Amino acid sequence: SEQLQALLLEEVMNSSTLSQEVSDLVEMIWAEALGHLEHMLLKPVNRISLNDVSKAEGILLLVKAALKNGETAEQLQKMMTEFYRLIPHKGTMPKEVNLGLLAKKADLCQLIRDMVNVCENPPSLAKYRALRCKIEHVEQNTEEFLRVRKEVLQNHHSKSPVDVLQIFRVGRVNETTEFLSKLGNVRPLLHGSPVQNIVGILCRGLLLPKVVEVGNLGSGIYFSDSLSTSIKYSHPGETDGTRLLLICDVALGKCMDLHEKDFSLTEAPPGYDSVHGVSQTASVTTDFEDDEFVVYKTNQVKMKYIIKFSMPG
């Protein structure tokens, strides 16, 4: 009958042959993201609307400019109270509004924005579709797995047991075409990141940090050739309890092997396309401890793999 053929299509349409490892990975990151929000939110995230988020972000812009202007705190409070009414927090209420606070508030909003988009169509598939990216599982039997494992396990300064559990292929749609392949020195590197932020990274890609008048080579996208250095970036997850890490074909081309730090770099130095923090080596004076490759463009990156791993602890 009419309604039955419809539901027959629904079961067929919704039955997307997907690997269970991807499903569990997708379910984790979105549960992890939700977990980070509910760690410091009174109001559930589902109750929050798109309107409140747009408003929230708007209020911050005024508060940001107000601090640089040099207003009294009294005025900052009343503005921020309206912000907190749209997005309720819990615990102590930051009473001191600084550049740093606003940056974190902005990040929180952006996560909440994503959580509203995904929530609408099962919960598993909707979360996959929301990323708008092709995530595939790779078997251990395949020889691709051994390549990726080895590329990870080469530059290992620290000697902690590395448990490479799950490896997934990944690649954004609009990134691949826009990626600067023609630019020279296209080598893969490791990007350390917390599990909570992954949902956003898979959606929008690696974006440039908002400048603050944390990084020692300016506001750019940081990478490393070493894994041990990336462990300090990528903390363990809350939901599953496993570190995630993105391997990306970073086109760094000409790279300046700087010894000294430089925080004023909004973009790359003149004549070169990247900056290489030169790690502290037998007898060469560098402030940089870790190997830090940095680019200052969204289209100088192309993510390839996602490494699910865990430390002894």
From Swiss-Prot:
Modified residues (Phosphothreonine): T92
Annotated PARP catalytic domain residues: 122-313
Stretches assigned to the PARP alpha-helical domain: 1-123
Domain of life: Eukaryota
Assembly description: Component of the vault ribonucleoprotein particle, at least composed of MVP, PARP4 and one or more vault RNAs (vRNAs). Interacts with TEP1.
The family this protein is said to belong to: Belongs to the ARTD/PARP family.
Name this protein carries in UniProt: Protein mono-ADP-ribosyltransferase PARP4
Source organism phylogeny: Eukaryota, Metazoa, Chordata, Craniata, Vertebrata
